[PDB]
C-alpha cells in the first residue's frame, strides 16, 4: 500500500509528511556524504554538529496570484539566518552541506496551474544593465526573503526576465537541470535531495552561493468561479551532512 | 546492437506510454512501445559526440596585432603596439564560448597554436623576416615595459620563438587552481559590498605578452596574432541550457538590452504545417 | 610513442565509451519502472 | 643522418588533427581531481533528457506564454496545434535537442514527443496525436491524420502520453539544416472527443509539450552552429 | 597462368562458335576454338585496371580564385574575391567526370590536395607572404560574409591554415548521407511539379571556403586556388555506356543541341580498309 | 631530436602517389553499406561484355 | 604502419584482385554450354 | 603519502613547539603538533622544485 | 628515403624544451667530480630552514 | 634513444627524488628530539 505518493523525512527533530508526492529526486543521481580524506586540502578536523544544524527551515511562505513571474533563492544564503545553522556558517572560515529542499503548495480538484522547481549549480545571474556591469552582493545574497521575479530592476541588482533564467538561456531548457513540477491535478509538494557540488573541497558559505531553487508558475494558476484568486507556496529546506572547518571570529558581510 | 527490436500487437493492462512528468524523470520509451517494429541494428557508436571529440579541434580564441617600427622616441611601447599583450582567457570569442559553457565545470590540457602574419600596408621595398617571441607572463611576474625590457629575458618563463608566416605549438597543462576550470561562478573574491560579481576573480590565469625580436628596418610591418587553443584530456561536469541570448562581456552572463525574440514567430497559425 | 615526458603533451584522449544518461534522464528516488503506473 | 622526403601538406595546420607537443611547463603538477556529481562523456546522453517545446510561436516578443499549447472545452473534431519535423529549426529550434544537433550535419533516429495536460482534476479529454511521414502533406483533419502514426491518449490520473516518432526513412540520415529530399514528416493532434471541464470551472486548460530523443538516435559530422555569432571580440 | 592452350584439329558435332546474341549472353570463345594454338602463359594480373587504381590518381577538380587588397569601403566582400568559395562537387571539371560516370553508385574516402600560388599582375615591390584559410563550412552552418566574420572562427569546423606556393592535404572519410553516391539519379526531391531533377538534390555536401589570412600590403596580389581530388577504399556498381556527347551542366545529363556527330564517317565505302 | 636529410623531391606533389593523410572529420562514422547487385572490381570485367560496332560508318 | 586514428587516413587499398565477370556477360537464368546449341 | 595525520587533544608533559633557536636548527614542527587535525594526503612530489628543473630552461 | 609531414610548430625554439643536441668539444673529458658538503637537490629543501623577518619594517 | 655519442648531448637530468634537508635544518652534533626539551 505504499504509494509514490505518501512519504515521511524524518531530520533530526522535524518530520514533514506529504500524502500527494510525484517522487523525489536525488541531483545527478547522489545522496549528500561527508568530505572523505581522500579529497581533503585543509588540515583542520571539521566539526559536524548533526541534529542541531540537520533539520528542516521552513522559510516564509510566497504568494501565487495569476500574475506572479516566479522566485529565487540562492543556498546556503537563504538559511543565513536559521537557528544553529547560520550560526556556524558566520563563525567558520569554510563548510559544506547538501540540502533537502520541499516545496509546497495545495489546492483543490477544481483549481489548474503548474509550477517549475529546479535547483541550478552555480546560477551566476546577469545585470539588468547590459555590457560588463556586476550584480552587487547584497542583490544577490537576499536571504530568506529570496529574490521576486516580477518585483522591478534595481541598480546594482540582477535582471528579473523570467523566458531568460536571469542569464541568457532560455525557459524552456532548465529542464537539464535537477528537477520536479508541481501540478496542481496531480502533485501537491515537490522534494530534491541536493548533494554538495563544487570544484573544490570545501568553500566558503558567504562568498560563493552553490545552487540557487527556483520555483516558476508556467501553466497560470486558474481558481474555481468566486474562489479567492491566489494560493501561498511554501519552502521548507533542511542541511544535511553539514560540516564547518576554520572557526575563527565571526564574519562580517556587507548590508 | 540493436537500433529497434522486432514487436507486434499488444493489447495490455501494461502501459508503457502514460508517465507522469511531474516527477522530473524522462521515461525511456521506444518506438517499440508503441508501433509494431522489425529488427533493426545501429551500425553507429556515437563517437563523434565525445565531449573529448566535442571540445577537442582548435578554435581562434584570440587576435591581437603588433608592429615593428622604430621605437625611437615612443614614450610608451605598449601603446605603440611595439609589443602587445593578452589577457589570456577562453571566452573573449564566442564560438568556442558557447560550446565550453555546455558545462558547469571543465578540465583539459590546451594545446595553443599561434600563427602570425604580417601586412605592410603602405609602401615597401621588400617584406622583412621577423622572429615574434611570445612570453607567457603569470601574475607576480613583472610585466614588460618596453619592447626590449629584462623582462624579455625570460629566464623561468617559458617563451617560444618563431617566424612571422609559420606557427608556434606548444602545449600547457590543466593550470587551474581547483579540480576544474568554474565555467560559472555565483559568487565573489571576498564579502565586499562592491567587489566585481562572476568568475573574472576566478581565472585568475595571467596574460602572455608577444613582441617581434626584430630591430626596424625602414618602412614599418604590421604583424597580427592569432592564438588557437584546443582541449585535450576533457573532463565536464554538470550539464546546462544553451546559450540563448547574445553575449556581452568576458565573464558575466549578461545579455544586451532591447535584445530580439530568440524564438522564431510562426507565420500562421498554432495549427499551421 | 610518446616523445614527450610530461602527460600533457600526448595527444587526444579515446573514447570514454562510458555512457550513462541514468543520472540525467532519471534521477528519481525510489525506481521508476516503464509499464507500471507512473503514480501508484 | 637518415634520408627523408617531405610530402605535399608539411607544415599546414589543419584545426582538427591530433599529435603530441611539448609542454610548456615541464614537470608541472595539476591539482588533484576531487569527485564532482554530474559528469558528461556523450552529447548523446544528454539529449534524451527531455526539455519543453515553444509550441506556441504565435507570439510577438518570447514569453513563457509561448510554452503553453491552449485546449477549449466542448469543441470536437477539430485541431490543437501541427507543426512539421524539422528538429533544427522553428519550434525545436530552441529546445535543449534541437540546439545540440545544430552542431552536427546528419541525424538519424527516433524522437520522443509528450505532452503533460495540467487542467483541472475534475475534467476530462481524449486527445489522438498524429505524425505523419514522409511523401503526404501535414493532414487537414482527423481522419487524415489518424491513417498515420497515432496514439488516442485518455487524460488521467497519468499526466504525461510519450508519443514517440519511430525512424521512418529510405536514406538512412536526414540533414539537421532543412532538406527537402531529407524532409521527415508532420506531427498534428486534434480532440479524439473532446475537453469537458467541471462545474465551478471555466476558461482554457493547457498542456506543456516536451521533446527528447530515443536511445535510437545517431548525431554525426560536426560543424558551427547558426545560433551565435558576434561583431566584435567582448573584452572584460 | 595459361593465355592460350595448345590445340590441334577439330571436326565435331560440338560447335562452341555458333551462339544465339538474342539471350543477352556474351559467350566466353576464345583463340583456340576457331584456330590451332600452342601454349602460351599470361605472365600478367590486371593490376593496373582495378577501380582502386583507375579512380585513385588525383584529378583537379576545381580552380577558384581570390584576392589580398584593402576591403577599405568594399560592399560585398564575396563580390570582390575577398574570400571565394565553392559549392563542392566532383563533376565542375570533366576529366575526372566521365570516369566516375561509368558507374552507378561510387563510395569512396577522398583526400584532397590544395595548392595555391600567387600572382602579381601589376607593378609591385615584392612578393608578399600570404597564408590561406580554406573552411569546411557543410550546409546548416553559418556562411562567411565578409573576409574576416565570427564565421572565420571555425570552432567546430575543419579548417586548414597553408601558405600560398605551398600546398595542403588532409582526407575526408565518405561524407555520403546514403551507402553509396548516386552518379546518377532519376528522381526529384518530392513530388513537386516544378521542383528539380537529377542528383543536384542528392549531393548535398555543401561548400568549402577560402580566404588569404594576410591583411593588405601597399600592392594588390592575385591568389589562384586548385582544388585535386583522389579517390581511395574505393566500390563501384553497375557498370553504364561511357559518355559520349559534352557535357553542358554539373548533375544533368543534357547535351548540346547541334552537337556533332561522334561517330566518324568513314573515307570510302563499307568495304573500305 | 633524430638527424635527418632531406632527399631532392621533397614537398613535390605527385599525382600517382599513395600516402596517408590527416582525417579532417575525425571520428565520424559512415553509413553502413547495403548490398547492391552489380559490383564492378576490374574494367577487364566489363570489356569482356559485347556492345554493337557502329560498322556502316558511312553516314 | 598507420600514423593516424581513423580508417580514411590510410592509403589506397590493395587489388580486389576479384573478378568475375558472369554476372556481365552471362547473366542468363538457364545455364548456357559453350558448344551445346545455343537455343535447343 | 600524507601530509597530515588526524591528531586530537593533548595535555602532556611532552611539548614540541618549545625549542632554543640559538641552536642552529630548525626543528620539524607540524600542524599537528598544535591543533587537532585530519588525515589529508600530499597529491605531489616536488618535481618542479628539483634543481634540474630550475636551472634547467 | 622515407616519407615524412612536418607538423606545425617545427622550426620554433621554446626555452623549455629538452632535446638532445650535437656536443661542439667530441671527445672531451670534465674534470672528476670530489666531495663537497652541501648538495641541494630541491629549492623544497631549503626553504625549510628558517630565516629572520624583518617585522618591524616601520623604519 | 641517444643520438649522439657524447653524454653533454642528453637531454635534461629526471628528478633527483633525493631530498634530505637535514643538512641544512639540523646541523646539529648532538640529536635534538622533537618534544624532548631543547636545553637539559
Ligand atoms: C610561450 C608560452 C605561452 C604560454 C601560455 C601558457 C598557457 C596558460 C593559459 C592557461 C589556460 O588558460 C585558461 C583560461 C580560461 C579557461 C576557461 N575559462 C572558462 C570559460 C572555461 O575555461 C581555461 C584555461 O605558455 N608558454
Ligand atoms: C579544411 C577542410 C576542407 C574540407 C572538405 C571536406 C570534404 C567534403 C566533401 C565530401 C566529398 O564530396 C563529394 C561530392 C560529390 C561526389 C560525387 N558526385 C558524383 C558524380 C560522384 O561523386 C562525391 C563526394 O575538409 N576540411
Given at each position: 500500500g505504499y504509494s509514490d505518493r505518501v512519504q515521511q523525512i524524518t531530520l533530526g527533530n522535524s518530520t514533514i509528511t506529504t500524502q500527494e508526492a510525484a517522487n523525489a529526486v536525488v541531483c545527478y543521481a547522489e545522496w549528500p556524504e561527508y568530505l572523505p580524506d581522500v579529497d581533503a586540502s585543509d588540515v583542520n578536523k571539521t566539526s559536524k554538529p548533526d541534529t542541531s544544524v540537520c533539520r528542516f527551515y521552513t522559510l516564509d511562505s510566497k504568494t501565487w496570484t495569476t500574475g506572479s513571474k516566479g522566485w529565487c533563492w540562492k543556498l546556503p544564503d537563504a538559511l543565513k539566518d536559521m537557528g544553529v545553522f547560520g550560526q556556524n556558517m558566520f563563525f567558520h572560515s569554510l563548510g559544506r552541506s547538501g540540502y533537502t529542499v520541499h516545496v509546497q503548495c495545495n489546492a483543490t480538484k477544481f483549481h489548474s496551474g503548474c509550477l517549475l522547481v529546479v535547483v541550478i549549480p552555480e546560477h551566476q545571474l546577469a545585470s539588468h544593465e547590459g555590457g560588463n556591469v556586476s550584480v552587487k552582493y547584497t542583490?544577490?545574497?537576499?536571504?530568506?526573503?529570496?529574490?521576486?521575479?516580477?518585483?522591478?530592476?534595481?541598480?546594482?541588482?540582477?535582471?528579473?526576465?523570467?523566458?531568460?533564467?536571469?542569464?541568457?538561456?532560455?525557459?524552456?531548457?532548465?529542464?537539464?537541470?535537477?528537477?520536479?513540477?508541481?501540478?496542481?491535478?496531480?502533485?501537491?509538494?515537490?522534494?530534491?535531495?541536493?548533494?554538495?557540488?563544487?570544484?573544490?573541497?570545501?568553500?566558503?558559505?558567504?562568498?560563493?552561493?552553490?545552487?540557487?531553487?527556483?520555483?516558476?508558475?508556467?501553466?497560470?494558476?486558474?481558481?474555481?468561479?468566486?474562489?479567492?484568486?491566489?494560493?501561498?507556496?511554501?519552502?521548507?529546506?533542511?542541511?544535511?551532512?553539514?560540516?564547518?572547518?576554520?572557526?575563527?571570529?565571526?564574519?562580517?558581510?556587507?548590508? | 546492437?540493436?537500433?529497434?527490436?522486432?514487436?507486434?500487437?499488444?493489447?495490455?493492462?501494461?502501459?508503457?506510454?502514460?508517465?507522469?512528468?511531474?516527477?522530473?524523470?524522462?521515461?525511456?520509451?521506444?518506438?517499440?512501445?508503441?508501433?509494431?517494429?522489425?529488427?533493426?541494428?545501429?551500425?553507429?557508436?556515437?563517437?563523434?559526440?565525445?565531449?573529448?571529440?566535442?571540445?577537442?579541434?582548435?578554435?581562434?580564441?584570440?587576435?591581437?596585432?603588433?608592429?615593428?617600427?622604430?621605437?625611437?622616441?615612443?614614450?610608451?611601447?605598449?601603446?605603440?603596439?611595439?609589443?602587445?599583450?593578452?589577457?589570456?582567457?577562453?571566452?573573449?570569442?564566442?564560438?568556442?564560448?558557447?560550446?565550453?559553457?555546455?558545462?558547469?565545470?571543465?578540465?583539459?590540457?590546451?594545446?595553443?597554436?599561434?600563427?602570425?602574419?604580417?601586412?605592410?600596408?603602405?609602401?615597401?621595398?621588400?617584406?622583412?623576416?621577423?622572429?615574434?617571441?611570445?612570453?607567457?607572463?603569470?601574475?607576480?611576474?613583472?610585466?614588460?615595459?618596453?619592447?626590449?625590457?629584462?623582462?624579455?629575458?625570460?629566464?623561468?618563463?617559458?617563451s617560444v620563438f618563431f617566424k612571422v608566416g609559420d606557427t608556434s605549438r606548444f602545449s600547457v597543462p590543466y593550470?587551474?587552481?581547483?579540480?576544474?576550470?568554474?565555467?560559472?561562478?555565483?559568487?565573489?573574491?571576498?564579502?565586499?559590498?562592491?567587489?566585481?560579481?562572476?568568475?573574472?576573480?576566478?581565472?585568475?590565469?595571467?596574460?602572455?605578452?608577444?613582441?617581434?625580436?626584430?630591430?626596424?628596418?625602414?618602412?614599418?610591418?604590421?604583424?597580427?596574432?592569432?592564438?588557437?587553443?584546443?582541449?585535450?584530456?576533457?573532463?565536464?561536469?554538470?550539464?546546462?541550457?544553451?546559450?540563448?541570448?547574445?553575449?556581452?562581456?568576458?565573464?558575466?552572463?549578461?545579455?544586451?538590452?532591447?535584445?530580439?525574440?530568440?524564438?522564431?514567430?510562426?507565420?500562421?497559425?498554432?495549427?499551421?504545417? | 610513442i610518446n616523445y614527450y615526458?610530461?602527460?600533457?603533451?600526448?595527444?587526444?584522449?579515446?573514447?570514454?565509451?562510458?555512457?550513462?544518461?541514468?543520472?540525467?534522464?532519471?534521477?528519481?528516488?525510489?525506481?521508476?519502472?516503464?509499464?507500471?503506473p507512473a503514480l501508484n | 643522418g637518415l634520408p627523408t622526403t617531405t610530402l605535399p601538406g608539411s607544415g599546414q595546420f589543419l584545426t582538427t588533427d591530433d599529435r603530441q607537443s611539448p609542454s610548456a611547463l615541464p614537470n608541472y603538477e595539476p591539482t588533484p581531481r576531487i569527485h564532482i556529481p554530474g559528469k558528461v562523456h556523450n552529447l548523446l546522453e544528454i539529449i534524451q533528457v527531455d526539455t519543453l517545446i515553444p509550441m506556441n510561436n504565435t507570439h510577438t516578443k518570447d514569453e513563457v506564454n509561448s510554452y503553453l499549447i491552449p485546449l477549449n472545452a466542448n469543441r470536437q473534431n477539430e485541431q490543437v496545434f501541427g507543426t512539421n519535423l524539422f528538429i533544427g529549426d522553428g519550434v525545436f529550434k530552441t529546445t535543449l535537442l534541437g540546439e545540440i544537433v545544430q552542431y552536427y550535419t546528419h541525424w538519424s533516429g527516433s524522437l520522443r514527443f509528450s505532452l503533460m495536460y495540467t487542467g483541472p482534476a475534475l475534467s476530462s479529454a481524449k486527445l489522438i496525436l498524429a505524425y505523419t511521414p514522409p511523401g503526404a502533406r501535414g493532414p487537414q483533419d482527423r481522419r487524415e491524420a489518424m491513417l498515420g502514426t497515432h496514439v488516442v491518449w485518455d487524460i488521467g490520473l497519468q499526466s504525461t502520453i510519450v508519443m514517440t516518432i519511430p525512424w521512418t526513412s529510405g536514406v538512412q540520415f536526414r540533414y539537421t539544416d532543412p532538406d527537402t529530399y531529407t524532409s521527415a514528416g508532420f506531427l498534428s493532434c486534434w480532440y479524439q472527443t473532446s475537453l469537458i471541464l467541471p462545474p465551478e470551472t471555466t476558461g482554457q486548460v493547457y498542456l506543456l509539450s516536451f521533446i527528447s530523443a530515443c536511445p535510437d538516435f545517431k548525431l554525426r559530422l560536426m560543424k558551427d552552429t547558426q545560433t551565435i555569432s558576434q561583431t566584435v571580440a567582448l573584452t572584460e
Open positions: 542583490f544577490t545574497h537576499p536571504g530568506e526573503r529570496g529574490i521576486d521575479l516580477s518585483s522591478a530592476n534595481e541598480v546594482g541588482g540582477p535582471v528579473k526576465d523570467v523566458l531568460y533564467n536571469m542569464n541568457g538561456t532560455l525557459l524552456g531548457n532548465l529542464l537539464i537541470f535537477p528537477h520536479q513540477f508541481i501540478n496542481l491535478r496531480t502533485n501537491n509538494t515537490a522534494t530534491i535531495v541536493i548533494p554538495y557540488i563544487n570544484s573544490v573541497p570545501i568553500d566558503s558559505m558567504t562568498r560563493h552561493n552553490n545552487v540557487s531553487l527556483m520555483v516558476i508558475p508556467i501553466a497560470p494558476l486558474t481558481v474555481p468561479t468566486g474562489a479567492t484568486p491566489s494560493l501561498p507556496i511554501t519552502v521548507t529546506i533542511a542541511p544535511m551532512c553539514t560540516e564547518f572547518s576554520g572557526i575563527r571570529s565571526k564574519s562580517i558581510v556587507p548590508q | 546492437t540493436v537500433a529497434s527490436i522486432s514487436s507486434g500487437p499488444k493489447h495490455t493492462q501494461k502501459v508503457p506510454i502514460l508517465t507522469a512528468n511531474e516527477t522530473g524523470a524522462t521515461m525511456p520509451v521506444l518506438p517499440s512501445d508503441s508501433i509494431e517494429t522489425r529488427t533493426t541494428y545501429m551500425h553507429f557508436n556515437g563517437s563523434e559526440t565525445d565531449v573529448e571529440c566535442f571540445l577537442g579541434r582548435a578554435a581562434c580564441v584570440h587576435v591581437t596585432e603588433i608592429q615593428n617600427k622604430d621605437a625611437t622616441g615612443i614614450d610608451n611601447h605598449r601603446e605603440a603596439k611595439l609589443f602587445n599583450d593578452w589577457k589570456i582567457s577562453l571566452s573573449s570569442l564566442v564560438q568556442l564560448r558557447k560550446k565550453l559553457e555546455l558545462f558547469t565545470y571543465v578540465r583539459f590540457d590546451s594545446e595553443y597554436t599561434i600563427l602570425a602574419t604580417a601586412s605592410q600596408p603602405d609602401s615597401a621595398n621588400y617584406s622583412s623576416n621577423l622572429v615574434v617571441q611570445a612570453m607567457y607572463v603569470p601574475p607576480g611576474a613583472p610585466n614588460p615595459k618596453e619592447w626590449d625590457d629584462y623582462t624579455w629575458q625570460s629566464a623561468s618563463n617559458p593550470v587551474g587552481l581547483a579540480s576544474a576550470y568554474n565555467c560559472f561562478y555565483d559568487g565573489y573574491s571576498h564579502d565586499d559590498a562592491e567587489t566585481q560579481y562572476g568568475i573574472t576573480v576566478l581565472n585568475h590565469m595571467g596574460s602572455m605578452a608577444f613582441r617581434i625580436v626584430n630591430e626596424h628596418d625602414e618602412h614599418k610591418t604590421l604583424v597580427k596574432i592569432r592564438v588557437y587553443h584546443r582541449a585535450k584530456h576533457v573532463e565536464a561536469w554538470i550539464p546546462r541550457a544553451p546559450r540563448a541570448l547574445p553575449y556581452t562581456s568576458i565573464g558575466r552572463t549578461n545579455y544586451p538590452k532591447n535584445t530580439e525574440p530568440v524564438i522564431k514567430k510562426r507565420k500562421g497559425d498554432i495549427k499551421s504545417y | 615526458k610530461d602527460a600533457a603533451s600526448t595527444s587526444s584522449a579515446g573514447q570514454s565509451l562510458s555512457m550513462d544518461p541514468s543520472k540525467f534522464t532519471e534521477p528519481v528516488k525510489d525506481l521508476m519502472l516503464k509499464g507500471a | -
